[PDB]
Amino acid sequence: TNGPRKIGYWSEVDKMVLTEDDTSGLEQKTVVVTTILESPYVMMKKNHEML
Amino acid sequence: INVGNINNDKKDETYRSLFQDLELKKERRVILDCERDKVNDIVDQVITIGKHVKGYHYIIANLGFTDGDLLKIQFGGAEVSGFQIVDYDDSLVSKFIERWS
């Protein structure tokens, strides 16, 4: 909305590299949730080390 | 889709028809691989048929992203992106642009 801006550059060797100034990057965040491991409310899955 | 041979004498409903056919597939992402003086005309028709709200996304596939009359789609909310070979951040370009303008 503020006007035409750079977001990256491209070259035959430098396949598309962004300028690390993308506003979209920040906005969407996530609440930190605190809890405690006790059954059956929160438990580690067998395959948790793959997740 | 070919858009070149739409003659200036009837370049009004043909562009509306063109996008109405795309609305059969409900297409949203569009590449405009056209010369500057045809990017303007299709962007102008893109507003007039209302298809520049957020949801659409046009890529201007030419080295003159800033050179067209870009402003009128800046606000509709459909993102627009493309390419430019000249970069006005360069001091030589800026000094040229002063000397040029």
Next chain:
Amino acid sequence: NSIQIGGLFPRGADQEYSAFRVGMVQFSTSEFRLTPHIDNLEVANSFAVTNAFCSQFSRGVYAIFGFYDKKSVNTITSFCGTLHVSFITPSFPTDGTHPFVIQMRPDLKGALLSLIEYYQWDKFAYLYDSDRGLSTLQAVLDSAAEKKWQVTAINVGNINNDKKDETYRSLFQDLELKKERRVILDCERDKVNDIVDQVITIGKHVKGYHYIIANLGFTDGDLLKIQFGGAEVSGFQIVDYDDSLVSKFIERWSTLEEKEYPGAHTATIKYTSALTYDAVQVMTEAFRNLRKQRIEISRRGNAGDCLANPAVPWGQGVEIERALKQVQVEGLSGNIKFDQNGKRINYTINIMELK
């Protein structure tokens, strides 16, 4: 006979003044000769309206044509209400039943409420220009209680030209907090154009939005560019081009030279100009009725001073008002009749819509 008539015209009323001259060319007659005197000062500046009025009053004109605005209207209505000089205008109806005001622009508020019913609206925005007067904002809000509507009224008038870009964006973005879709535009066409031009620029003319142009000039704006957006647009027009008399006029009108009648060289005419052309017919027809009834207009040329104290009414203005409010003719605005208040009755408005 020759009849001296007054004229105050807003600066830039080129098509209205052209229509006034065309009306004179059409409705003049050898028996009695309406002879304008024209003054061109800012209608929004009540001093200028007052001074020009008193100048033309000192000229002894038997009636004044012109226009008024929400500021000067209280001068014109009150002076004429006192001085018995009939004032004929296409401007918006006075709220009060003021005598000696002959106001052509018919009641829109009743038609507006009926159309809002017809679309079954309950929640909508209503954008008004403050400077035309809030009589229409009152009449919709009065019914919004009984009809349990949710009118989101917003002032859009005082947005200055220097910043009329971000503000219309901001205005509709605030409406997008409620996610309003139905919108009434209650503005002069010079402002309906600007807001529609911004409405397309912000993209809000896709399917879902629906605008009602609450003025008698639905076709007189730059309507074309929202015709294809996929939204719907509707409103009102007082002139109907289906009429043979209108069509014959429009040919006679559009064929004029734009040097002599600027803005007339078009197949369309502003309702203000149409009511002006109809006004010249009505003024002729009233004085015709006087001559039919052998009434004497013979107020002396030394009519006195507007500031004369004690106040000095004149008898013939009462007879002029009686005739004016009793004339019936066809015109561009269809059939006309007046009540004793000088407001129109037994008329019809053509409801228009943009397919």
Next chain:
Amino acid sequence: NSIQIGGLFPRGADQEYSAFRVGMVQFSTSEFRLTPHIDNLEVANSFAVTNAFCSQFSRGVYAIFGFYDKKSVNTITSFCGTLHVSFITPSFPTDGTHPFVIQMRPDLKGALLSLIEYYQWDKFAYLYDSDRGLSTLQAVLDSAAEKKWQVTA
């Protein structure tokens, strides 16, 4: 020195006119004797207000003081905007930044709209009368649209 002033009072304004007289008895001094040209005419009638205003101009008073109404304010602010005659009034504030009019009544809008937020109101009736300028109504309507209130005006 003696200094004629215009006095342009509504009929029935006795408690303000008495306060004008008592004010004159308090503040006046022989050095510059403010001398009211009083007029008592229908303030809602623009003809009488204009006629008296012209008469008080025609006696060359250095200032005019009086009250006006939503009918006549379009005359006073325009005459004072032209003849540069300074008009002092406590009647309802004019919306425009009109020169040569002095209005002693403060702007209510911000204080009322603040009280609504202090009361944390969100749905209220707004009964109003036209004859003090609809500036108050417009400000609650605009704020209610922004603050997502409802108003039964």
